[PDB]
Design an enzyme around this catalytic site. Structure first.
Site, PDB file in Angstrom:
ATOM      1  N   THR A  43       0.626  -1.120   0.023  1.00 21.88           N
ATOM      2  CA  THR A  43      -0.075   0.107  -0.271  1.00 21.88           C
ATOM      3  C   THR A  43       0.872   1.245  -0.053  1.00 21.88           C
ATOM      4  OG1 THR A  43      -1.546  -1.286   0.953  1.00 21.88           O
ATOM      5  CG2 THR A  43      -1.999   1.189   1.169  1.00 21.88           C
ATOM      6  N   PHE A  98       0.901   5.118   0.605  1.00 25.12           N
ATOM      7  CA  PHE A  98       0.516   6.034   1.309  1.00 25.12           C
ATOM      8  C   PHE A  98       0.955   7.724   0.971  1.00 25.12           C
ATOM      9  CE2 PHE A  98       0.020   2.468   4.070  1.00 25.12           C
ATOM     10  CZ  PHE A  98      -1.271   2.556   4.897  1.00 25.12           C
TER      11      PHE A  98
END
Ligand SMILES: N[C@@H](Cc1ccccc1)C(=O)O
Ligand SMILES: N[C@@H](Cc1ccccc1)C(=O)O
Lengths: 278, 278
Positions: free
Chosen positions: B169, B171
């Site tokens: 992920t 961010f």
């Protein structure tokens, strides 16, 4: 086979989609859904490809890429939650609504305003329905599909429970590439503005993508989608997903495609396909 | 040390990401996360923007565009699931594994090959490590981060439980538009290969995107992300997410952006930022 493989259980939005094509065969997973087609358990399958609130499902794309599979239609499912109780149906007697953690979050309004009702984590939304119907307990609510309510004989207490409309899942109905069979589908794709989906890979040179778009844009061809993501074990590549309006056998299209193969490291055509409506 | 708002509870991946930037302030919604900055409850926020397995998070891009906020940094968190248990606990002894339904389904092989251990849905991953510690039975395990286990004094029974080895992920560390202070992050972002993120909308004419990309490409500017999705707001249009290497106020870049602004319906620069390596 008129079976349409999907991931989930009855009342899942995925089932809703397979219903637009045929007789749903539910499956444990995505990987499992593609395999029902490969090993001939099912002729068809519907896979969620993108959701308006999340992204593209890159897992389903790596599978479309690797599986000897072909898209035959697209469909669009409006994910609308229903709050859902047993017959004799009240919100002001309830102690809980169960659902998938993401449905629960998406219905976060309903919960801040209704603190006599506590969010409960469930494996999925369809099973949440299922639990209510078996627990023979009018206290517990589920947040699920209208279809789940239908099915588990529940009443709708509340429609559009999340204050999101435009939560849409697009799915691709797919078959094995060695028999793009349209004739056995429940309703034949609306082909009036037929789409082609492809994946391609560029060596990551300044300009490459401009160059690959040129291929379509100087040929009069309209895109409806484009996405990059990086290639992981091919060194210095991105993968691109692109959809555009046109049939793969159209000469202009074919010329575009050949043009691309000149410098693309790979092209795959996942299919040319029309749309099935609710 | 300084407050990084993030969505979830201690243990979470979003918290791991918060911590590369300051002291984490856990929040129930992303709405709460932004509204936390947008009204000075916290100076920064750490927002998940895409995952290698799902895709972009549209709903977040959505709020990044509607909020008086600016990317200050990006980092990449490897979503690595662990089987966690109490000191003394056993895979041959365990009865349940609790996690978020998505982490459950991402470790689907594990569950297939261990039918003794039932998969059990929970609100999130970290809260699953919490429940395991609080219930004090050695037969119930969690699937969660290594962080969630340390926090909770749970042993790590297996590292890398998921089907797919590459789960990551990305961010953004964000701040208020007119409080764009890098000094009070915990380490300065690597700005050598500085990236700029923009979004724009085009009237949907054939060739639009080509014409927009022409803007960067004929200028020597190298893209690292391109993606479309349909304008939720204007009748006939598409939004595009673009990332490229350079800064807003490079001569180059500025030219490009100005030219874009010539025919785009809208352009917002979301910010120019470097990268935080763990
Ligand atoms: N259809 C337009 C705009 C567009 C591009 C890419 C994806 C979606 C829309 C074009 O062909 O250039
Ligand atoms: N970096 C290349 C290829 C690329 C395009 C878009 C996204 C990612 C990579 C370019 O600028 O065209």
């Amino acid at each position: 086979n008129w079976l349409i493989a999907y991931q989930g259980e009855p009342g899942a939005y995925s089932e809703i989609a397979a219903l637009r094509f045929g007789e749903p065969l539910p499956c444990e997973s995505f990987d499992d859904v593609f395999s029902a087609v490969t090993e001939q358990k099912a002729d068809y399958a519907v896979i969620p490809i993108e959701n308006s609130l999340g992204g593209s499902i890159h897992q389903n794309y790596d599978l479309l890429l690797r599986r000897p599979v072909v898209i035959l239609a697209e469909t669009f499912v409006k994910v609308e939650h229903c709050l859902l109780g047993l017959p004799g149906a009240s919100v002001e007697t309830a102690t809980k609504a169960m659902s998938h953690p993401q449905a629960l979050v998406q219905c976060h309004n309903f919960f801040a305003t209704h603190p006599q009702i506590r969010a409960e984590a469930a494996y999925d939304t369809a099973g949440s329905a299922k639990m209510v119907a078996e627990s023979r307990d009018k206290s517990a609510l589920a947040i699920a599909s209208k279809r789940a309510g239908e099915l588990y004989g529940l009443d709708i207490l509340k429609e559009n429970l999340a204050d999101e409309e435009w939560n849409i899942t697009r799915f691709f109905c797919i078959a094995h590439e060695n028999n793009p069979d349209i004739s056995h589908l429940k309703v034949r794709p609306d082909v009036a503005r037929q789409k082609t989906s492809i994946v391609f890979a560029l060596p990551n040179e300044q300009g490459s993508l401009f160059r690959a778009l040129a291929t379509f844009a100087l040929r009069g061809i309209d895109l409806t989608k484009i996405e990059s993501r990086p290639s992981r074990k091919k060194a210095f590549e991105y993968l691109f997903y692109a959809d555009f309006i046109g049939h793969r056998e159209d000469q202009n299209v074919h010329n575009a495609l050949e043009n691309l193969r000149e410098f693309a490291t790979m092209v795959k055509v996942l299919g040319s396909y029309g749309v099935v409506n609710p």
